């Protein structure tokens, strides 16, 4: 029945790092009484775990212990403060200590770090660990007083070997009742026992379990090269994310931009490389962000001569928008690492940047509030969650292989599909991030972060950030955007973007398909029935029309007109037209895909009970000119129904007429640029073409389901 | 509802159905949805007979036989698991789940046709745990069992530190496990059980297309934890054979399972409503099979005779001289003389009456072997266990030894190696054979007529030792040179099989361990009785010492003795 108030927590930490804050949060979760030593004092040691060290905490605790040299009734425990996260309540800890009944319990470890020779001197242990680790201990104040009063060495002396030598004395160990926790009852060192720990969820809290010994530890000390694994473990224990209650320390600690002052200055950046499709859309989208232009400093670094005309066209609009606008053209012959590094240094040497916000070329931000929410988060580093459409490829990583390469974690499939929501600790981010300026200034002062080795610049950047001890958070609470596909982007066309129908269908539809199509499909009117069994619904936007006529005029070869044919297997056209079939241009497969995806459902909803697979063999674009060819004679079409789409605006470019249904006395006189005509053409509908008078007109015709 | 899918299970069905019949659950509250398909044997007929006989005892029986085809065209053999077979089995399991749902039946137990559910209370015990999915832990001759404690990411076995502590029942308890298979209960009364399916894989299912993995994913997506319970010893199952294995290998594996049952339990009695196939014992091509047994021992005698009839091994019972019942005048009339200076190396005794009786029993067997001119004879002690395929593997080895010729005298088949060091030299061109070193546990060996003649010509009666001290002397492998110095003819060509086929039934210190050889009085006097000193019994089992660096890699192994699936 030990009272909880007799236990005092003692930790040492020179500075205040994010790890120390995490430990403080974990300790405060179970109302622990923590006293910190060496707060602000210089680290008179050296490398934390490279070869040796730890000779200053002993001196500090020897100076501290003089106040409690006689407090027998008090129980004191010491522990690291940078890679330790508490998990259990004090009551169970003191209960376990009472059950052990020793005077000083040390955390046991698997290997002998400082020396190897003294291994045989250790008393034998059945199943658990045998050696001693200096990661912490629990003991009476008099006992620790006696054991550590004997310290008289240099401040740079190693620590664990002194404890090992003191423990190895048999008589003193018997007198001091020194014991080791071999079966992981209190302390669990993640080094060497990575496979003996599993996460045991609960309702409103989380814990860890040692499967090998079937016990629940209280303190975990992820020492050694296990920073990644303990950092992963810190996402849940003890209040990270439980199924009942969402996220924990994920909603508080927000700036909320109060005061009405001009919002903190932002140094935007753009790195257009590996030529990115749909560039003009992103350049246009660069303006409509929800942040005042006077507080936005742009830096557009190009690396492609191919994309030079687009940036040149867009440049004046940006120049009028932002307070400061700069360009670095492709002629500088600058590798991406240099670009990122001098952008980083340009902000780093300008005290007026407070959040250096990179944004790569292939990251479309469909949410216009990304900057506001991310800045409100006030994380040291933070990235938004973007994933390819209908895949698993995201912009972060779960865990790193021993080769420092992409492995697969366990929760990654959860996080990519938003089954879990919060702000997650992550060992690699890219393609969009928000870094705090102070971290740039007094935390990353060296210049060479992206260059300096053979590794990729991004991996080098995250590796540099990992060793310095800086967290790389990541949030996916809302929806932020999607990553484009630049695996293959041919550029041997006037508008090579038109071939991107397979690669990025959603943005292709957004740019190209007429904006009124979806509303018409879901059934709020729009579609018209000028004559029975005839329908008028808009399909294409103006960009499709103008880029298509541009491509076809680039080809230029206007074959057709003769009553015979070689493109036809039969070799005898019922009626000839001057036409360019999609087969010779190489665009036919994309057109069949478009018919399959964006026309089929329209016809199925328009004609109930009809089922289609959208097969088309003959598809072409016909030009009507008053001098080349007149309109067609009355005839019939060799297909179930015919899709008829105009390609240029009537009046502004040409004057004429549309279709003429003989059996119904129907005349179509005003074709629209972005609309399509659907009508059966086998039996019921005898149609004739009206003659063009002035100008030149283009019409797209296809025969589906022959 | 008790379900059962059976294919080519005719060797196993008689004992398994009797075990199901012995379950203490009211048959008017049970059912049956037994289906059988793609049978190459008479399984459908045996099952039809049983179901016809038991039909009036159960609430209902739904029978869906398909006698043809006997195989799929995409199958390479009876043990090949093709995708078409996996798909069909998944469809069958889905249909069984549907049948279970339509009668609103309380729970479904999918018993596999090769699972021996020997504990009659298995159902009541599993029901009392009140779990949505719970499997009885089934025991097997290996680390194999009906559950996995771990999976990496593709659904393959992943060794975990929990498996061995669970497998040995050092930790008893219902344990969360990522997979249970073969035998498991689903509670259909629990609401969450409605979303489980085996036929349509989950839309998000992206793992290997395998019937046990797909169901585990469905369980995972439904948030249904599959618990495994090992609180009791529920029963036994055979180990999955290799793909190129025959139906005979499967039948022999199941027979070995029944033999292992018979090691610690009364025999699993077959159903009285099912016939039993006639066995035709043979002597496996040996000239004689001897069985040494103490007249006072009958439990072991009966067990061994049943085990031999099980393996179709003909044997001649050989009686034995009870040296403990022997008086001095009988020993003297036989001319039995102890080797001068003989002292048991572990305790400090001259000998026991039991060791004398054993020695004289072997001497009498060797004499009969010589008098009859028996070219090859097998000698058994009564507390042996069989390796898998024992008879066929031993007959193949002996046929290879004879065909390739060998002047062998005492090829050891089962022993305790006492010299634990560098490997022994493999005999060239003879597979699975090594030169024998110093050995304890002379439980059984084959001897040739030449060896028996040499042993009789050694005149061993004037220099009596225990058989396990005499034999290493006779092959010049005895470590004590003084004992060899007591003898002159040391020309036994002794070899040993590497994969021993026989082990003790009980080791020293095992529960039920009794030694009629060690617990005997001293040859002389009657007040010097030696009790078994639990502290002094030493050679309990020469196997834990063996997990050392004895190599043994270089012996030509036989294709036999191959088993396990991805759970070992």
């Amino acid at each position: 029945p030990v009272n909880p108030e007799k236990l005092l927590v003692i930790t040492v930490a020179t500075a205040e790092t994010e790890g120390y804050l995490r430990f403080l949060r974990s300790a405060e979760f179970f109302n622990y009484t923590v006293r910190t030593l060496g707060l602000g004092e210089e680290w008179r040691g050296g490398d934390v775990a490279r070869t040796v060290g730890g000779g200053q905490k002993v001196r500090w605790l020897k100076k501290e212990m003089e106040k409690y040299a006689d407090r027998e009734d008090m129980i004191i425990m010491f522990v690291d403060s940078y890679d330790v996260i508490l998990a259990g309540s004090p009551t169970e800890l003191l209960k376990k200590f009472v059950q052990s009944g020793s005077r000083l319990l040390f955390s046991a470890e698997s290997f002998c770090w400082p020396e190897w020779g003294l291994a045989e001197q250790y008393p034998e242990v059945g199943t658990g660990k045998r050696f001693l680790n200096s990661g912490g201990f629990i003991g009476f104040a008099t006992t620790i007083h006696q054991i550590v009063r004997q310290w008289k060495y240099k401040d740079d002396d190693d620590d664990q070997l002194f404890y090992t030598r003191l423990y190895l004395d048999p008589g003193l160990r018997e007198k001091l009742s020194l014991n080791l926790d071999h079966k992981s009852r209190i302390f669990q060192n993640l080094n060497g026992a990575l496979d003996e720990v599993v996460l045991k969820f609960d309702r409103n809290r989380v814990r860890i379990r040692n499967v090998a010994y079937d016990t629940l530890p209280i303190v975990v000390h992820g020492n050694g090269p296990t920073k990644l694994q303990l950092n992963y473990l810190g996402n849940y224990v003890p209040n990270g994310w439980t199924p009942e209650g969402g996220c924990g320390f994920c909603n508080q600690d927000r700036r909320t931009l109060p005061g009405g002052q001009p919002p903190p200055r932002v140094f935007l950046a753009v790195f257009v490389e590996q030529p990115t499709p749909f560039l003009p859309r992103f350049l246009q989208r660069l303006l409509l962000l929800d942040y005042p232009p006077d507080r936005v400093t742009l830096f557009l670094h190009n690396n492609e001569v191919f994309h030079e005309p687009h940036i040149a066209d867009s440049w004046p609009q940006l120049q009028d928008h932002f307070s400061a606008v700069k360009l670095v053209g492709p002629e500088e012959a600058l590798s991406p690492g240099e670009a990122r590094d001098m952008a980083m240094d340009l902000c780093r040497q300008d005290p007026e940047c407070e959040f250096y916000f990179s944004l790569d070329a292939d990251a479309v931000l469909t949410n216009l509030q990304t900057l506001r929410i991310l800045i409100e988060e006030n994380r040291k580093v933070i990235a938004p969650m973007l994933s390819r459409h209908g895949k698993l490829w995201s912009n972060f990583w779960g865990a790193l292989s021993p080769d420092e390469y992409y492995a697969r974690s366990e929760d990654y499939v959860e996080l990519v599909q938003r089954k879990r929501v919060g702000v997650w600790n992550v060992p690699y981010i890219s393609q969009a991030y928000v870094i705090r300026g102070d971290t740039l200034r007094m935390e990353l002062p060296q210049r060479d972060v992206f260059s300096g080795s053979d590794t990729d610049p991004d991996m080098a950047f995250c590796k540099s950030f990992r060793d310095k001890g800086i967290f790389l958070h990541l949030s996916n609470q809302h929806e932020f955007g999607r990553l484009l596909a630049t695996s293959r982007y041919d550029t041997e066309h006037l508008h090579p973007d038109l071939w991107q129908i397979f690669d990025n269908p959603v943005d292709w539809k957004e740019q190209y398909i007429h904006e009124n199509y979806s509303r018409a499909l879901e059934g709020e009117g729009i579609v018209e029935q000028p004559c029975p069994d005839v329908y008028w619904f808009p399909l294409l936007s103006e960009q499709m029309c103008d880029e298509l006529v541009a491509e076809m005029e680039h080809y230029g070869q206007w074959s057709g007109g003769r009553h015979e044919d070689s493109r036809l297997a039969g070799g005898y056209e019922n009626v000839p037209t001057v036409d360019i079939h999609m087969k010779q241009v190489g665009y036919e497969d994309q057109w069949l895909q478009l018919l399959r995806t964006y026309v089929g459902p329209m016809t199925e909803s328009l004609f109930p009970g009809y089922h289609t697979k959208a097969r088309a063999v003959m598809n072409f674009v016909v030009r009507y000119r008053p001098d080349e060819q007149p309109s067609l004679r009355p005839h019939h079409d060799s297909s179930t129904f015919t899709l008829n789409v105009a390609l240029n605006h009537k009046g502004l470019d040409y004057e004429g007429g549309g279709c003429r249904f003989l059996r119904y006395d129907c005349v179509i006189s005003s074709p629209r640029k972005g609309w399509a005509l659907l009508h059966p053409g086998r039996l019921t509908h005898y149609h004739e073409g009206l003659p063009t008078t002035w100008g030149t007109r283009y019409i797209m015709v296809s025969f589906v389901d022959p | 509802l008790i379900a059962l899918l059976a294919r080519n299970a005719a060797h196993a069905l008689p004992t398994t159905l009797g075990a199901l019949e012995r379950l203490r659950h009211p048959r008017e509250r049970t059912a049956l949805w037994v289906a059988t398909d793609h049978n190459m044997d008479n399984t459908s007929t045996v099952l039809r007979e049983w179901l016809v006989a038991v039909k009036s005892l159960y609430h209902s029986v739904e029978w869906r036989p398909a006698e043809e085809p006997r195989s799929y065209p995409d199958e390479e053999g009876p043990k090949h698991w093709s995708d078409s077979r996996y798909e069909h089995v998944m469809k069958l399991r889905q249909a069984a789940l549907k049948s279970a749902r339509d009668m609103w039946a309380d729970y479904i137990l999918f018993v596999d046709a090769d699972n021996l559910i020997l504990n009659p209370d298995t159902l009541s015990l599993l029901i009392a745990e009140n779990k949505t999915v719970v499997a009885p832990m089934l025991d097997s001759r290996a680390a194999y069992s009906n559950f996995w404690c771990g999976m990496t990411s593709q659904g393959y076995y992943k060794r975990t530190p929990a498996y061995i502590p669970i497998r040995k029942r050092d930790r008893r308890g219902c344990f969360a496990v990522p997979m249970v298979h073969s035998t498991f209960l689903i509670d259909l009364r629990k609401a969450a059980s409605r979303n489980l399916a085996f036929y349509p894989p989950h839309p998000d299912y992206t793992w290997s297309f395998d019937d046990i993995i797909v169901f585990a994913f469905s369980c995972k997506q439904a948030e249904v934890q599959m618990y495994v319970c090992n609180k009791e010893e529920y029963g036994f199952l055979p180990v999955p054979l290799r793909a190129h294995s025959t139906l005979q290998d499967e039948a022999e594996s199941f027979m070995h399972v029944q033999l292992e049952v018979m090691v610690k339990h009364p025999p699993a009695e077959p159903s009285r409503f099912i016939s039993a196939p006639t066995k035709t014992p043979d002597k496996m091509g040996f000239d004689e099979v001897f069985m040494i047994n103490l007249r006072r021992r009958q439990d072991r005698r009966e067990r061994m005779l049943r085990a031999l009839q099980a393996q179709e091994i003909e044997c001649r019972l050989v009686e034995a001289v009870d040296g403990k019942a022997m008086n001095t005048s009988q020993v003297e009339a036989l001319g039995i003389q102890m080797l001068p200076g003989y002292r048991d190396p572990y305790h400090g005794r001259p000998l026991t009456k039991g060791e004398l009786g054993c020695f004289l029993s072997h001497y009498n067997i060797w004499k009969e072997v010589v008098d009859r001119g028996l070219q090859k004879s097998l000698v058994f002690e009564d507390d042996l266990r069989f390796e898998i395929f024992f008879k066929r593997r031993l007959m193949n080895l002996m046929r290879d030894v004879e065909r390739e010729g060998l002047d062998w005298d005492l090829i050891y088949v089962g022993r305790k190696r006492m010299q634990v060091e560098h490997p022994e030299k493999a005999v060239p061109r003879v597979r699975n054979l090594v030169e024998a070193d110093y050995s304890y546990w002379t439980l059984a060996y084959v001897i040739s007529l030449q060896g028996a003649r040499k042993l009789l010509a050694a005149e061993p009666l004037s220099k009596m030792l225990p058989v396990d001290e005499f034999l290493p002397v006779m092959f010049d492998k005895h470590p004590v040179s003084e004992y060899k110095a007591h003898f002159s003819l040391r020309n036994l060509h002794a070899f040993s099989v590497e994969p021993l086929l026989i082990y003790p039934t009980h080791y020293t210190g095992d529960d039920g361990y009794v030694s009629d050889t060690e617990t005997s009085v001293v040859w002389n006097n009657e007040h010097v009785k030696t009790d078994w000193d639990r502290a002094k019994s030493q050679k309990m089992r020469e196997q834990q010492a063996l997990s050392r660096e004895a190599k043994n890699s270089d012996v030509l192994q036989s294709p036999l003795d191959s088993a396990a699936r991805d759970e070992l």
């Binding site: 694994q229 697969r408 | 948030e223």
Partner: peptide
Amino acid sequence: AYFPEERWSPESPLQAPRV
């Protein structure tokens, strides 16, 4: 793949009786 998860869920309530 480090630290395999143990996501438990409370059992579902019993289904309503038939009629």
